[PDB]
Amino acid sequence: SNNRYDVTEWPAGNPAKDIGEVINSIIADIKARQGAADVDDGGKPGAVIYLPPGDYHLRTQVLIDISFLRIEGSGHGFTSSSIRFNVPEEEWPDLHELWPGGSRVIVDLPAGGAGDSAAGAAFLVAREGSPRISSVEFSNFCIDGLHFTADGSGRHPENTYANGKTGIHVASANDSFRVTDMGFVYLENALTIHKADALSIHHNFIAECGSCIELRGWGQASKITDNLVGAGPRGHSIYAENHGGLLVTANNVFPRGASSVHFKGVTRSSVTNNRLHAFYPGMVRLEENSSENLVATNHFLRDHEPWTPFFGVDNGLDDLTGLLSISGNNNSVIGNHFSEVVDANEIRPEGATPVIIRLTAGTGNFVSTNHVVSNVDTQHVLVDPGSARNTILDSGSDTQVVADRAVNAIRATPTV
Amino acid sequence: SNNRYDVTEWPAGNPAKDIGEVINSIIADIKARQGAADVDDGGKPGAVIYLPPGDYHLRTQVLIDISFLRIEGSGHGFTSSSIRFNVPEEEWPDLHELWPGGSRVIVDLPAGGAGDSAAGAAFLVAREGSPRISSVEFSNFCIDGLHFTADGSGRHPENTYANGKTGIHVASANDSFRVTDMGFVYLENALTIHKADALSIHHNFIAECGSCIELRGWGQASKITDNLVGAGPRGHSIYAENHGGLLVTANNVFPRGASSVHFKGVTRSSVTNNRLHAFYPGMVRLEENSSENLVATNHFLRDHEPWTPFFGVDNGLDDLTGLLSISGNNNSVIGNHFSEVVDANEIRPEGATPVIIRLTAGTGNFVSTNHVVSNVDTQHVLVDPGSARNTILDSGSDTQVVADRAVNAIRATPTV
Amino acid sequence: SNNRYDVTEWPAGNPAKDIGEVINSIIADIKARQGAADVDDGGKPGAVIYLPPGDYHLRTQVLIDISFLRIEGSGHGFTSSSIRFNVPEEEWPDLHELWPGGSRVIVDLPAGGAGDSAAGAAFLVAREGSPRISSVEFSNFCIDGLHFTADGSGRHPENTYANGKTGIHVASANDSFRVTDMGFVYLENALTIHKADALSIHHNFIAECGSCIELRGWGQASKITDNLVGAGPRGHSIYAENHGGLLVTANNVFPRGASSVHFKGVTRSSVTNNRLHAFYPGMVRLEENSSENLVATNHFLRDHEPWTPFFGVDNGLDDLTGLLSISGNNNSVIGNHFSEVVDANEIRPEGATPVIIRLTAGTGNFVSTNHVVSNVDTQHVLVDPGSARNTILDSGSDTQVVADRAVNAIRATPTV
């Protein structure tokens, strides 16, 4: 074989009923043909698996345990299942289409057990031993979790962002992975990648999923670029933990994730030049000694949800949280724009001054030239007693920077 | 069928004479085979249409009225038709190539009627009713308008930037569209997309077209990233109207569009980190209550046209226009570099001080740490009487910031 | 033919033994079939050459002398050959894979002569005469130089970063070229492009090569975006000379190149919003009248090498060099973050204060709002006597900005 596979032209199995069995069957063939690891300076180059545009049901989890496997399609096929499930059911046979399309993988797996959301993943990338599994590519296909289900919260089942399904789950240490041009829709978790080195997530459309991008465990020298991201109110849009040298740029993050970016103990990383829009506070969270990070030239918009099916759904956080919350040392917050739109009548807790940037802990945080435009009075910067020895420049007037001048360097934005 | 089409292997029609008829014939086949919208949790996944590298004439407009249609090629095939048409005609048979290449669609349509430039579009994406037409992809092919024609302006016909031809025209509301890796050349309009939600224009080469990117009507949460853009002096390089949450980054915009970026009533968007180069003033225009936008870390160069066929062609605007013109409220202009190269002898109007940043209207505009390097004296910032209550920091000395100190906060850049 | 070629389905030659002969044979066929340059408004559209995933040996240099040639694969196949060659040899038969994969081109060429590293290039793009060779595309395949060899330096042969092999070498003036989604590994030079106009290097993985990206001779309006880059200590990560309008963004440059970015006489370009990490000083060098450049919102980390096989390897430069060295006029250094981790016991020369930003020559350089976090005392900015008339704002306290106040405008970062 020439290492080129098409799921519609594989003899064993049929991809309409179960594309999981088909791809696993292909992976078996690749391992059979690529047994030896050092023959003429080569051995296991891997292979490419092609999904033509189509509606493929996946009933078996795809296990990927080989390096250099590309899975490509010919279309991300996103349509807004959220909108359609909220359209009256009578009007459905008049709609031009109902379901997502492209090269579509329908995740027909049940929810996973105790700490086993991995068991409900369409694609599981896992391997033990050395070296790190490397250069697996997912390109330009659709992954659909189809329906959200009742969570006992009382809301309409299709608006819970709950089904125990994952698009792609990478369990093992990985080097040089790529997720590009994908479409993820209607999954509790779109993309969960543990232990990622030199990972690239470029130019995906990841929307109407509970959580979109979670980089878990740890990682190094990775980048999340040029994505369109929208999550649900109990989940993360972009999340990373214990990462170093992460680059988060050029993303357009829209609602309705709890956060837009959420870092737990992330260091020496850069969250710069993204468009961020949420309907709740707590848009960007640097937590648990997230230190020496650059947060720069981003555009923040926080406003009220206008779409009436989610009117009065929130993420549990009040306006004193801040749009940018920082618990950690020596970060750099430079050149950001913040737009705060809130109605004075509905500011929680009653009658507080909403806060934009908040330093809850740590020291040496540099905050310079940030511009806040708000329809109400705001605390541009709020430095808790738990944080000290911070420099805060041109980010508000003396009224707008609430902080103890004894232990912090402040310059007020000139006025009048 | 497996929803995979190749224009060179379609029985009905021949793509050398008319690829328009061929693709429309394919679209008819897709609609025939994908009638039902809800069969086994699916129905109309769409399809992919492949253009091998070749010279294809298009004589019929391609109408796209289905979601999830990908049209892909294998090469953007840009060569500079402008350069070649200005090379002496005697030398033409010595040139290695003459025409553009790649997967080439030659637009052989006549110009459109009154308000109907849409009729001269090679690709028309239009549909009525719900939902929004979604996830149409144009990838890695060439669209050539072949020749520019006489406009009665007296200039050489091939330098008018005038033929009534459009590359791609999207008329209807659309969600999750993509234009990637394309080559557009020698069209009056390269890419015109009305009413665009979550649109992505990543990594295209869009040059020697009258106007390149126009986002018209309205739109939300879209992004124009990583493009190489060059327009003509009566047209737009990047234009958007009535957009929210637009992200314009990582573009290299070269001459010779009138503007590099032009916003009409665009809000809460970000034009950051682009390289911008024009031969005229008015490089970036925020007009008609373009408000709460971030303009950051861009590199502006304005200089004289050196290429002698366009020597003394301009866009009608004088040096008092400004490089960055702002008419709107609460924008953020941070960290930009401006290089102004003009000859003192040819500054229009005679003997004026050229202006870099200009605030013609609105209030609350924040302008901090911008650096201007000019071979002459310049008005780094000019605040008209019509604009007030702006903050202007470290963007010039007191001489260089022309503004009424009573109603604006100014800090001069320290000196000497 | 339809201009579509597959290296595994070409009759003349076999790509396992010599893919160079196969591709050159294909190029001969394309020139044979595309003789005429103006037939029905077309002539030489070019072609696409496909490499399925596989282990292909290249023994003949591929000469590309036609416009619009795409060479595509289906996988970048990077694995870390550096790690594996430093793993004990006994453990090798237990490793899951050894070699890189994807669509793999193994460079089996010997080293080149005097000033002829071009002779050891797998892919040579060269043409004389007009117009500029245009829109050649390299996409999503692997280029492997296989082994590094003894350089007489005493270090292990596989750690010398020395074999005289180049991945892709472009010798001639070129317009609208693309290198996207590639994997380069174990080459002395990954990508060397002379005389490049409107070049795009988007989304490549270029690691464990002596030098990765060199833009040589001259060039205009090009961009290096969204790459993962790692070089060797005698070479360049990103290098450009005599370029204008270069855009370097969204890159994650990791060790162990001498520099992360190195400019020789580069003007009116932008190095903004990259993550930069080196184990040595001299991370970003603007040299030989590199002027009017924007260096903005980047994240710099300099620390000690932790990997014991390269412990005590360096690039020859001392801590007085600076992380950002500037020799040229009117540059803009805005919004950068710098993390300096050094052990006081090993600061060369003995007991000096390490410098972060250094201005060795030129005038009018604007340096505003830069934040330095260091485990030791540092010279945040050092202005040599050879540089004067610079503005330096909020980039350190008066102690931390070493400069002559008579001929430079300084504002200290407020304190305490």
Ligand SMILES: OC[C@H]1O[C@@](CO)(OC[C@@]2(O[C@H]3O[C@H](CO)[C@@H](O)[C@H](O)[C@H]3O)O[C@H](CO)[C@@H](O)[C@@H]2O)[C@@H](O)[C@@H]1O
């Ligand atoms: O809020 C975004 C979030 O909601 C979803 C599901 O509805 O899309 C909503 C959507 O519309 C919102 O924004 C438009 C413009 O502000 C507004 O008219 C509408 O009322 C809002 O619901 O948001 C995007 C653009 O931001 C639109 O494409 C979409 O219709 C979901 O897809 C997303 O996660």
Ligand SMILES: OC[C@H]1O[C@@](CO)(OC[C@@]2(O[C@H]3O[C@H](CO)[C@@H](O)[C@H](O)[C@H]3O)O[C@H](CO)[C@@H](O)[C@@H]2O)[C@@H](O)[C@@H]1O
């Ligand atoms: O000015 C760009 C504009 O003109 C076109 C058509 O000529 O390309 C011109 C071009 O050259 C210009 O820039 C070079 C370098 O400054 C200069 O030598 C020449 O005189 C200029 O015309 O511009 C790009 C680079 O900016 C070159 O590739 C090209 O030759 C057109 O393509 C473009 O819209």
Ligand SMILES: OC[C@H]1O[C@@](CO)(OC[C@@]2(O[C@H]3O[C@H](CO)[C@@H](O)[C@H](O)[C@H]3O)O[C@H](CO)[C@@H](O)[C@@H]2O)[C@@H](O)[C@@H]1O
């Ligand atoms: O230093 C990067 C440079 O080295 C190479 C070859 O070893 O990769 C090294 C690598 O690990 C380094 O970083 C990790 C995390 O800091 C550390 O544990 C290890 O000791 C270091 O060698 O660097 C990248 C991430 O930066 C890892 O993927 C890789 O293991 C080479 O690939 C690169 O040019």
